[PDB]
């Protein structure tokens, strides 16, 4: 009701920031100049999910559907089941719970049903191997994601199980100012109701692109035989590069189109991974907002993270503007001394935040 936003910009991020702050927000003029002007089904179902995991949180949707009033409550959590609508996958319905999970009154055991792959949002293996290590660095210990059945577009029938146990008081502030030596490159190519020949063709194209390096490279094959395969057939590949010493990881992933060549898919994913590593600095460009908001809610202390000038872009700017508007916090940015690159140390005074919802 008090902090006012415009447009359909950063819906789940704004909801998460409202919940973590406690400041009541109102998002107005949502998709005004359209022919079905208002909200979306995945948007209203995400609001249903937020109301299901919190307590005493008042959400009201205008009859025009272009103005949402959110007044946030406390974070109960628990064990639940969300049947996501088919327009968006469970990666999109999971990532805000990755923001909100370990700061709750109870542990998180949620069972998501729907599609588990898209070109837009996060795949399950991507979200595991890519976003879990950032949280395990920031200091949550027992977190995991099981895959009971794995869907595929446009039919899905996939079930994932998010389980997060460690309820920490606040994330420990991080001091990463270096550029991690990448140890190895691993990956995984999965397939629902198509052939092991297609799986091996994907991994062969990937290794053919990555053959020009020296580090160890290993991609596993994951065919899904039987009842845990969903309805529609499809395939996809996910690649990660691990720095074993500090335990960092960068990643890129994609799926197979309706009539594309698996070798070309492997080439595209390998080149996207190498481009992300070239445009990376101690984080991924898709991991960045997670680590930024965690350093913001870390305790009352300067936290330091080495990011890249290329990693500064439009979305970084709009994220920092949203953070400045909600938490009243600024990111100081000092350039690193070394002149072969133009890395910037980001120092954020993590504001005083505590997991005040827990029971003792």
């Amino acid at each position: 009701k008090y902090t006012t936003f415009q447009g359909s910009q950063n819906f789940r991020l704004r909801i998460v920031l409202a919940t973590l702050s406690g400041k009541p927000i109102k998002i107005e003029k949502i998709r005004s100049g359209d022919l079905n002007p208002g909200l979306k089904d995945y948007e209203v179902s995400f609001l249903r999910l937020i109301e299901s995991v919190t307590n005493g949180s008042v959400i009201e949707i205008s009859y025009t559907g272009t103005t949402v009033i959110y007044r946030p409550g406390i974070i109960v959590g628990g064990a639940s089941t969300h049947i996501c609508p088919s327009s968006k996958p469970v990666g999109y319905f999971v990532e805000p719970m990755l923001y909100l999970a370990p700061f709750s009154k109870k542990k998180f055991s949620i069972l998501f049903k729907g599609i588990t792959a898209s070109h837009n949002d996060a795949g399950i293996e991507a979200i595991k191997w890519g976003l879990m290590p950032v949280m395990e660095k920031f200091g949550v210990r027992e977190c995991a994601l099981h895959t009971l059945k794995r869907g595929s577009p446009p039919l899905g029938g996939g079930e994932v199980h998010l389980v997060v146990d460690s309820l920490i008081a606040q994330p420990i502030t991080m001091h990463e100012i270096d550029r991690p030596i990448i140890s190895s490159i691993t990956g995984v190519a999965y397939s629902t109701r198509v052939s092991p020949s297609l799986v091996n063709r994907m991994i062969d194209g990937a290794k053919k692109v990555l053959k020009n390096l020296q580090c160890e490279v290993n991609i596993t094959a994951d065919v899904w035989r039987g009842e845990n395969s969903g309805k529609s057939p499809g395939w996809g590949i996910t690649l990660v590069a691990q720095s074993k010493q500090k335990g960092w990881s960068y990643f890129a992933e994609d799926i197979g189109d309706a009539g594309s060549i698996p070798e070309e898919l492997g080439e595209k994913v390998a080149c996207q991974l190498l481009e992300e590593i070239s445009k990376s600095a101690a984080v991924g460009r898709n991991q960045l907002p997670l680590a930024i908001v965690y350093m913001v809610i870390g305790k009352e202390d300067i936290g330091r993270l080495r990011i890249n000038k290329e990693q500064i872009d439009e979305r970084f700017i709009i994220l920092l503007r949203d953070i400045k508007k909600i938490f009243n916090t600024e990111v100081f940015l000092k350039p690193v001394d070394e002149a072969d690159n133009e890395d910037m140390i980001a120092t954020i005074k993590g504001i005083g935040f505590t997991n005040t919802s827990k029971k003792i």
Partner: protein, 682 residues
Amino acid sequence: PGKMARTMQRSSDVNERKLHVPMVDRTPEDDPPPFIVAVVGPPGTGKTTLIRSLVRRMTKSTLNDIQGPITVVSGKHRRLTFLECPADDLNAMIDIAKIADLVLLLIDGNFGFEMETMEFLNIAQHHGMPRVLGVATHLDLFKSQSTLRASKKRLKHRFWTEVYQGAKLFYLSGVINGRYPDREILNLSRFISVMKFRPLKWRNEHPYMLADRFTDLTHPELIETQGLQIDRKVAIYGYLHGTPLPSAPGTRVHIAGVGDFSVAQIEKLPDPCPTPFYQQKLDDFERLIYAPMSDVGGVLMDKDAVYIDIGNIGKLIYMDNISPEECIRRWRGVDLEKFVPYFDTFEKLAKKWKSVDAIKERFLDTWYELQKAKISKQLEINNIEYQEMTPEQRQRIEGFKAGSYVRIVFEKVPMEFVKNFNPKFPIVMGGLLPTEIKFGIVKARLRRHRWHKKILKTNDPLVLSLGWRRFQTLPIYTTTDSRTRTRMLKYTPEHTYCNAAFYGPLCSPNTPFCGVQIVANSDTGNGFRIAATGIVEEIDVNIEIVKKLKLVGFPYKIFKNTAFIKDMFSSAMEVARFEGAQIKTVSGIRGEIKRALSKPEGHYRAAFEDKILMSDIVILRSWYPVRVKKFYNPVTSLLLKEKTEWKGLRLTGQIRAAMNLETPSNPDSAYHKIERVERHFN
């Protein structure tokens, strides 16, 4: 040999005495604030004369008419803010207990250890014990030195039961000339000048201040046209302790005993009582007391009259007008729902990534001291990245760190406050969190205090100090039936802990709080006033909470193993709601209710495990949910004019007495004495 072994054991024991629990200091090493010293005692023990003698020695200034907080300098690096608390105002005592860091506890000598001294000891011990220091006055009245030394030793040992043993207390002899003996005052002042303090959690997590100077800012013609009822814009001057107060306008602070405000404007001002080393460095880079509310020199300011004695990518980002595309255009020369980032086309990426050299470049003793070293490392990294940028960081992102004069102007402040404010009482400002601005019901655990006589009743008001606020609520005292339910009680137990749940503003778990009963000086009497103490355990917006009612019926036709019970319900529709259920008797035998009857309306048949008798009573245990009343009432004592005898909700016994009723009673529930006969069977 033996000497080596015995000194090994002794050294081991003293090391394991010296270990501790790591806490974060949060105090400025550079320019620390004045330590706050608070004089507490009964209303006759000479604390004005003590504060006058201490100021006169500390700064060589005779200082009549002490009122309001008063900061003086001491040593090369210390300043002391002396503050007198009144002894008629339990709210003032509670505020002092939360804010103070050294407590000068002055107690009478001819008369021993009054209740106000004991009360302040216990409320400070609950809200976190600051460094306390006893002095004992009135020692001239003792006739014989045997009586004098006996009294000295008895007060000393009761005090050592209260505080750590060996807490030294200073004996002041006579009030000869509006002051005390200079020898004992020198010893006292040297001790409080070399006092050493310890880290406390509430201070080291919250930003707070004690307001020195006070003024309101409204137009006289605005007052004239609106008619004196208008909320007045008020400025507040003082120091800053504890935690960096954020420099952005729009925050929520509690002025204790007034209300709950966002600040309107904040302005850093340089201290009028500066440290000697501060002034040394000030004069070096260029090439005494401060007491607004009281007298100083020979001049005192009134409301308006006077009385005098006769004689850059970062700022491009955080600019809000510019489109981000224009910002990145300037720095060089979309949404986030697409979690995949933007990329380059496939053939361009492959053509660029024929080569791998540009990325082959990047490719391949005591644990207490360890933890305290980690804290120190983080503190020094804090320090150097603070030192990196002066006009941006320490002005804005670091807030206004402790030890800086600040002026803060507010809105919506009450006319009652501005009019009836008299400067003998303190005004504390604590910086709340969003967790302490929200509301819900809190679950604490608490006992009745050990020196309070009467036990506390469920759904009966209780004023309590929790956080900065001092609000009156209706708690509900519950137990958990061996960790199964949350059944409510009707009283608190007399010598142990019971859970409690009550409406009110929320505070962090593990927070100690302390509740009193009646707080009027016109209602004190002679009993101890502190009522309950405990810790708030958890927060919620809704708890389930249960009261047990047992439906009672009597048998009227018994058989072998089967009876017709008659009086529990009213209708066969009711019994059909309740059928198949589990009943027992007073006599202990179990059974179930099995079927409704038809010709009488509320009768049923039940099967038991032995032949029930006619004399007995069947019962059905049932769990009805109760709900917590939503009464919330802050004190606002210094908004009130008299500032004592704040009277809110009365207690149940006093309500019955004032309305001339009598206590309810059940004569079929009062116990009797039973003498049963030895029974013989055929």
